[PDB]
Chain length 148, copies 2
Amino acid sequence: DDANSFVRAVERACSERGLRLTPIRANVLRLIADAGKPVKAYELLDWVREGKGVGADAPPTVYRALDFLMANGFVHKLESVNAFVACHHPNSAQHSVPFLICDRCHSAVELEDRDVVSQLEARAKALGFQPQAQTLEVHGLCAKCAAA
Amino acid sequence: HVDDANSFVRAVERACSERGLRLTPIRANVLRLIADAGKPVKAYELLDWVREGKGVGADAPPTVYRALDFLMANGFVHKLESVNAFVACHHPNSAQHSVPFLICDRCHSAVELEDRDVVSQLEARAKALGFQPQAQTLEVHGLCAKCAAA
Ligand SMILES: [Zn+2]
Ligand SMILES: [Zn+2]
């Protein structure tokens, strides 16, 4: 229900935004949702292929589906560990620390300064948000994308 | 070719290409109107400007509000609750004293983070983690208490 909660929020978001979930995009979304942990690009391709030997999606098609999710902010690249993670959503605890994500490149870094976060979360609760129903995200621009 | 608000419209158009979104004329029209205005814009005002820009044949109000919902749902435009008016996303090099926004990802309502102490620390942490808080003001994304309860 963790994974179903993620799929439902992205489907709801796509409906609202005018985005289209083709079959591969829904397939990839489901595999990422059912992982519940960061995913390597090679694991996603293996999983997509596990269905049919010959009738499998070509790798570029699989990775364009992953880029679609990243570009729309449903998935980030945790470059810490060279893997892909679902956006924060109304999910469980025990792996929830805010993400800092770049607008252009969709890499994420985890904000691990407990008192900066705690202050940020306090400000947001006072201002009408629920930092514990959904872990916050900070969105900005990385130094590397800023250089161009 | 493109100055500073024109860069913003360009980058939204590029983002549409990478995301799988269609930027119709009315969507580009409302975006450019919001971007060129500097100050938050009321909805009735965009509707005014859209009619003034076109004249005979103007888009009906439902078309203009749906284009605004498109822009909000995709995070290019927020509704600033305090002034009940719309503002562009934070974007690169807009030259001003801008402050970070806190946006609900469900209703697209935003509020400014006016706590200098908390903002200063966040930007300091972001600079330490590899980001450029001066190249583009930070946004914080969360779920509002009202949207959470519904
Ligand atoms: Zn980047
Ligand atoms: Zn809300």
